[PDB]
Amino acid sequence: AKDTAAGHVTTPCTEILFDLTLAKHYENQIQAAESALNRNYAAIRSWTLLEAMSSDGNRQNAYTGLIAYGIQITVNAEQELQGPKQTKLRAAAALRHRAANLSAALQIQAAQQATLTKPTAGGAQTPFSGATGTCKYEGITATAGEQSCKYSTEDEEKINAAHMNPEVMTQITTIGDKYLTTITLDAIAGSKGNPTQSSATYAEQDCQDGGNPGPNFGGANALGLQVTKLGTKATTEKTNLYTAGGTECEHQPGNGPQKTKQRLAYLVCEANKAAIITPTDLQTLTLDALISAPEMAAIGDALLIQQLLKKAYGQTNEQFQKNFIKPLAAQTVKFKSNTVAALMSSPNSGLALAYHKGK
Amino acid sequence: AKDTAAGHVTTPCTEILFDLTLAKHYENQIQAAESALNRNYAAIRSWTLLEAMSSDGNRQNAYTGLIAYGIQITVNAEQELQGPKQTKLRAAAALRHRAANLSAALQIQAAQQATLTKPTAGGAQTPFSGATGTCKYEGITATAGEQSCKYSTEDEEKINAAHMNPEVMTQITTIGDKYLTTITLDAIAGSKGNPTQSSATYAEQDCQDGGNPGPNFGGANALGLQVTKLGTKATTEKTNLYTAGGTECEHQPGNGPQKTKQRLAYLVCEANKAAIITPTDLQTLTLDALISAPEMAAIGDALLIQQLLKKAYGQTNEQFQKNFIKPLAAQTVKFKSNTVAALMSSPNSGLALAYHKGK
């Protein structure tokens, strides 16, 4: 089923939730990838220490092969991350920017009741040069209390990173531009008798004189207006991410002016297409992943093919784990105390290496 | 002179420029620090290759000392960056969020001319139960063309990262909240004759009947209103970053409700106080910086004090540069071609290390 999340956007608040949720999804993809690289670099420092601490030549070559393998794949994956990272961050910033815009518009569009000021009565005056009575109001205002978006359990279940994988997203839903640009209001004028510049009794926030001025045009002559409501209705719009053929982004820029929804759909499409490749996690490497890794052929040939690799790293995963993986979190190093991996990510990392390479 | 940049904020557009400029300043501080770390890690990979390519034991120890020194300071500086990074990013996100808000409010507050709709005439009706004539308008709107902020040369010279060092910043200036929450308008009603529900000639966007209805209340009886302008005036406000004593952030959260300006001032204060420590640039290391570096005492003692260091790295900077710095960009490595530093940041980094450690 496609477009579960976008198909749940029906209001300004759910567009805000979609936009923020998708931005956080892209941000989290980058953070996860960068965490995988940092873990790999921490593994490389750990093996560097173990390589300096081993006396056996072939075991030293074994660690060196893990160092070389790790450097190759992690440097490559870090370089490869840069394009997708920038593409995804471009979309996340724009989505956050849109959600801010919409939240600000929502607060203003909630200002739906006017407070009248005290008017001033006149005769003919611009823009009613032909009137015999005018009632002029300055500084009518409308303000709402602080608005907040409330989400139900299902809003948060449907508009969710779990439904934002690229394979299920074909469109975005946005609030129409009028909500962000247009003030709307209703107003009504009322007249009774012969209102003039002498209609200067203002106690009812209108212009009255004659008889007994009072509530509900109590007086003989009365003129007034009210702004009886404000607020522009939100509408929704759909925008496709892809061309009709399905591969290419719709709404590429540079082809003429675009609306906000079109610019957002383009950025979302590109961010969806910019898949991240995460390299192997070195800290949980298995024997089979190592010897079947394509980079290990030339590395093992340089240092020692798959028969040679097993000869270096173990015939089973159990002994590979014991010799090359478990020491990272379990082997203690003390000199003048910490486990290998934490030590080589600590303030004493360099000093532990110098101490053991010199000893 | 303090507060050059904030003292130049006098309008919504210059607050937007300040907020975006400061966010980019914090972002650039993080990027610069991370670039310095990446350069250092690239130096460490380069020395790792040279250490594998050297035949002399003491020259191998020399490279190892540079590796150990680089790992220590760069891992430490990377760990130390994390708190300040998050503090600065918190402020940059909030400043961008505010600038978005303000730009959206600016577009709405620019909608200063109303378009009247065709009214409907009535007699007495809510909210004028006492009127004999009413003229009711639904869906009056106000919309502006697309707004943009224009900056002068001096706006960009004063509101500039060059004036945003922590030592010169004591306050921020923000637009008052009413600009973001309140619609303001002027309106006027006009009456002539005896307008009633029969005043149903609407050609002038008012209610007329009798005689010859026409422009300027041409008819005998007329009722109408106009919204003659809209728009809320921007005002500015100052908020101090520090308490009266000058050390501590003012506007710490958790002490009661806060306004937007207070939350922003707190984040800006904390981001200003969260100074980043950048480590030595390994790729341009001098001899004197190396031997005077505090970490090199224990490292050199472990591998080889300052007399020992000169013995290992050179008596002059010229020979230190030749032996340990210049080979990074100048020494070519070829096997089955690239300079050392680029090779060890390339897809063949790991393989170059394996090849030379095995040879």
Ligand SMILES: *[C@@H]1O[C@H](CO)[C@@H](O[C@@H]2O[C@H](CO)[C@@H](O[C@@H]3O[C@H](CO[C@H]4O[C@H](CO)[C@@H](O)[C@H](O[C@H]5O[C@H](CO)[C@@H](O)[C@H](O)[C@@H]5O)[C@@H]4O)[C@@H](O)[C@H](O[C@H]4O[C@H](CO)[C@@H](O)[C@H](O)[C@@H]4O)[C@@H]3O)[C@H](O)[C@H]2NC(C)=O)[C@H](O)[C@H]1NC(C)=O
């Ligand atoms: C969040 O909400 C904010 C607030 O509304 C949005 O911010 C607005 O974003 C739009 C789109 O990015 C901005 O419009 C752009 O404005 C720039 C600059 O325009 C000014 O400077 C130009 C020279 O630098 C000048 O040519 C312009 O003057 C022309 O245009 C005006 C208006 O049409 C016209 O009156 C003039 O006579 C000129 O003809 C102007 O002075 C402009 O460069 C951009 O142009 C590109 O895009 C449009 C639309 O695709 C296209 O027509 C062009 O051909 C060109 O390709 C564009 O107009 C706007 O200024 C922002 N408003 C504010 C207050 O900041 C923001 O987009 C929202 N974000 C999200 C993610 O939702």
Ligand SMILES: *[C@@H]1O[C@H](CO)[C@@H](O[C@@H]2O[C@H](CO)[C@@H](O[C@@H]3O[C@H](CO[C@H]4O[C@H](CO)[C@@H](O)[C@H](O[C@H]5O[C@H](CO)[C@@H](O)[C@H](O)[C@@H]5O)[C@@H]4O)[C@@H](O)[C@H](O[C@H]4O[C@H](CO)[C@@H](O)[C@H](O)[C@@H]4O)[C@@H]3O)[C@H](O)[C@H]2NC(C)=O)[C@H](O)[C@H]1NC(C)=O
């Ligand atoms: C950009 O512009 C946007 C749009 O205006 C700004 O977004 C607004 O930000 C403010 C401040 O962060 C948001 O207000 C917060 O709202 C949350 C959630 O409130 C709702 O949920 C609560 C439970 O989760 C509930 O208690 C709330 O109900 C109470 O409050 C309302 C309103 O006062 C009242 O009517 C109720 O009866 C209850 O008494 C509500 O349903 C809330 O948790 C926050 O409270 C903290 O902060 C306030 C002020 O410091 C303080 O009073 C509290 O004691 C508490 O410490 C806060 O109210 C607001 O919802 C956002 N609006 C929208 C549309 O998103 C944004 O801040 C701008 N950014 C920048 C950087 O300029």
